[PDB]
Design a protein around this ligand. Structure first.
Ligand code: HEC
Ligand code: HEC
Ligand code: HEC
Ligand SMILES: C[C@H](CCC(=O)O)[C@H]1CC[C@H]2[C@@H]3CC[C@@H]4C[C@H](O)CC[C@]4(C)[C@H]3C[C@H](O)[C@]12C
Length: 71
């Protein structure tokens, strides 16, 4: 499968899967979640534990606006 880009108005956000599979061996961080996780994602989740928050907790990954968002 291909990587996906989230079309944030302020700038595209790339999500590179390979880096995540390598750095996050605990796959159940994102996979086998109960239903609702597709409908649930949004800015609040992204800037929280959906993206940014995990980067902060794991001490690696982009945490600045311009590191995630890029036109
Ligand atoms: C969230 C941060 C994830 C983590 C951690 C892991 N995966 Fe993942 N996976 C995630 C998304 C959003 C997607 C679809 C979009 C994309 O960029 O691919 C996937 C996709 C997969 C796939 C399909 C890949 C392909 O066919 O090329 C597989 C087989 C998969 N994910 C498995 C997997 C495993 C085994 C993980 C742990 C090591 C893992 N993923 C981490 C989100 C996230
Ligand atoms: C943990 C549960 C994570 C979630 C959820 C998301 N990310 Fe992540 N990401 C995580 C780690 C531990 C790392 C470091 C990987 C490395 O080897 O450097 C990353 C990295 C990224 C990157 C940069 C990848 C690179 O090759 O440098 C990007 C661009 C990124 N992450 C984006 C991203 C987005 C958009 C997410 C939500 C949709 C997201 N991550 C979730 C851990 C986790
Ligand atoms: C990655 C770890 C991010 C960081 C760091 C920041 N943002 Fe973000 N933001 C991210 C994603 C994946 C999304 C899309 C959510 C979705 O619905 O798929 C967003 C969203 C926004 C938005 C809203 C965009 C829209 O609704 O079209 C804005 C205005 C925004 N982000 C701005 C922003 C700023 C100013 C940041 C630094 C303080 C910042 N983001 C960090 C991922 C990430
Ligand atoms: C469920 C995990 C982990 C966050 C959490 O614990 O809730 C999060 C992390 C990244 C999230 C994905 C980001 C890209 C997609 C954004 C879409 O708008 C909704 C579907 C996708 C595919 C999301 C599904 C799900 O919302 C994921 C996989």
């Amino acid at each position: 499968a291909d990587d996906i880009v989230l079309k944030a108005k302020n700038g595209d956000v790339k999500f590179p899967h390979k880096a995540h599979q390598e750095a996050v061996p605990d796959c159940k961080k994102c996979h086998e979640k109960g239903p609702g996780k597709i409908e649930g994602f949004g800015k609040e989740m992204a800037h929280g534990k959906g993206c940014k928050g995990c980067h902060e907790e794991m001490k690696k990954g982009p945490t600045k606006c311009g590191e995630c968002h890029k036109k």
